[PDB]
């Protein structure tokens, strides 16, 4: 539904990068590829992304502590595997809801690239969700509403409505 | 130079939260002894918790402590009343903190987007509430009030205020 190269152009501006790179794609999985200005070609969504995070000089997006960085890769793997999701997205939503009951962010208390990425990858789903389901997945709703209104993140992505209380 | 003197036995937590939240927007000292009051032109003073929070949030507009809408302003005031009435002395606490659990469901901040007076104020009074402390050691809390309390607790200027005044 949203190509990973389209995702990376969107991330560049999320981060606040002014420069915008040409991105390729390779094969039928259509993996994103960067003919790079610092080594051999970069490949995959989360690798390029890590790079851009670094280009932006915002390293604290991949975690500070060893243990937050392990959490950050955990949600990065999760995004490439379970999110890029056909028959049942509910099972994911249920799980994430429980994970998110005691957490503002996907890393414990901090904003990381996990939040941005998991948000973009879930966006097409949470859009197609009913008013009833958003109640059922309360913590997901909260976290998402939070990420949409995080500074600079949403860009031109659709706003999902979330009855305030 | 605006200076506030804090009640040395019972710091008004939340007052200093705002002070440490507004250090880099206006010149502020903190002194101790006496009672908790704030001096601004020292012919004009404020000596009540919710006055001082509002005044600092109004003067340091560079901070976002008062919100952006007029609606958000109204909420922020609402929250200060709520905490100063319903979280001051407990009676119907269950229905008191049901409501704080209930509206925190879809909100990261009480505010909507970012930290505002509502938070500093509510969190400070909650903390000093021992009935809610009893919910904590018995691990029977409202789940949304917990993350919210823990989230804010963990934060930078929130930890410093603890360290000086516990």
UniProtKB/Swiss-Prot annotation, chain A:
- Can you supply a Gene Ontology BP term from the record? translation
Q: What is its main location?
A: cytoplasm
GST C-terminal domain sequence ranges: 51-165
Positions in coiled-coil regions:
151-165
Hey, what tissues is this thing expressed in?
Answer: Down-regulated in various cancer tissues.
Q: What is this protein's expression induced by?
A: By DNA damaging agents such as UV, adriamycin, actinomycin-D and cisplatin.
Residues annotated as region Linker?
Answer: 58-64
The answer to keyword DNA damage applying to this record is no
Record note on what altering residue 74 to R does: Disrupts interaction with MARS1
Give the sites modified to N6-acetyllysine.
136
User: What keywords tag this UniProt record?
Assistant: Acetylation, Coiled coil, Cytoplasm, Nucleus, Protein biosynthesis
What Gene3D superfamilies does this protein map onto? 1.20.1050.10, 3.40.30.90
Record's subcellular location: Cytoplasm; Cytoplasm, Cytosol; Nucleus
Under the cellular component aspect of Gene Ontology, which terms does the record hold? aminoacyl-tRNA synthetase multienzyme complex; cytoplasm; cytosol; nucleolus; nucleoplasm; nucleus
Subunit structure, briefly? Part of a multisubunit complex that groups tRNA ligases for Arg (RARS1), Asp (DARS1), Gln (QARS1), Ile (IARS1), Leu (LARS1), Lys (KARS1), Met (MARS1) the bifunctional ligase for Glu and Pro (EPRS1) and the auxiliary subunits AIMP1/p43, AIMP2/p38 and EEF1E1/p18. Can interact simultaneously with MARS1 and EPRS1. Forms a linear complex that contains MARS1, EEF1E1, EPRS1 and AIMP2 that is at the core of the multisubunit complex. Interacts with ATM and ATR.
Instruction: Report the function annotation for this chain.
Output: Positive modulator of ATM response to DNA damage.
Specify the protein name: Eukaryotic translation elongation factor 1 epsilon-1
From Swiss-Prot, chain B:
Look up the domain of life of the source.
Answer: Eukaryota
Q: What are the subcellular locations of this protein?
A: Cytoplasm, Cytosol; Membrane
Task of the protein: Multifunctional protein which primarily functions within the aminoacyl-tRNA synthetase multienzyme complex, also known as multisynthetase complex. Within the complex it catalyzes the attachment of both L-glutamate and L-proline to their cognate tRNAs in a two-step reaction where the amino acid is first activated by ATP to form a covalent intermediate with AMP. Subsequently, the activated amino acid is transferred to the acceptor end of the cognate tRNA to form L-glutamyl-tRNA(Glu) and L-prolyl-tRNA(Pro).
Illness association: Leukodystrophy, hypomyelinating, 15: An autosomal recessive disorder characterized by hypomyelinating leukodystrophy with thinning of the corpus callosum. Clinical features include motor and cognitive impairment appearing in the first or second decade of life, dystonia, ataxia, spasticity, and dysphagia. Most patients develop severe optic atrophy, and some have hearing loss.
Entry similarity comment: In the N-terminal section; belongs to the class-I aminoacyl-tRNA synthetase family. Glutamate--tRNA ligase type 2 subfamily. In the C-terminal section; belongs to the class-II aminoacyl-tRNA synthetase family.
Subunit structure, as described in the record: Homodimer. Part of the aminoacyl-tRNA synthetase multienzyme complex, also know as multisynthetase complex (MSC), that is composed of the tRNA ligases for Arg (RARS1), Asp (DARS1), Gln (QARS1), Ile (IARS1), Leu (LARS1), Lys (KARS1), Met (MARS1) the bifunctional ligase for Glu and Pro (EPRS1) and the auxiliary subunits AIMP1/p43, AIMP2/p38 and EEF1E1/p18. Forms a linear complex that contains MARS1, EEF1E1, EPRS1 and AIMP2 that is at the core of the multisubunit complex. Interacts with TARS3. Interacts with DUS2L. Component of the GAIT complex which is composed of EPRS1, RPL13A and GAPDH.
Quote the record's domain comment. Answer: The WHEP-TRS domains are involved in RNA binding.
Please identify the protein, giving its name as recorded: Bifunctional glutamate/proline--tRNA ligase
Q: What organism, scientifically named, is this protein from? A: Homo sapiens
- Classification of source organism: Eukaryota, Metazoa, Chordata, Craniata, Vertebrata
Gene this chain is encoded by: EPRS1
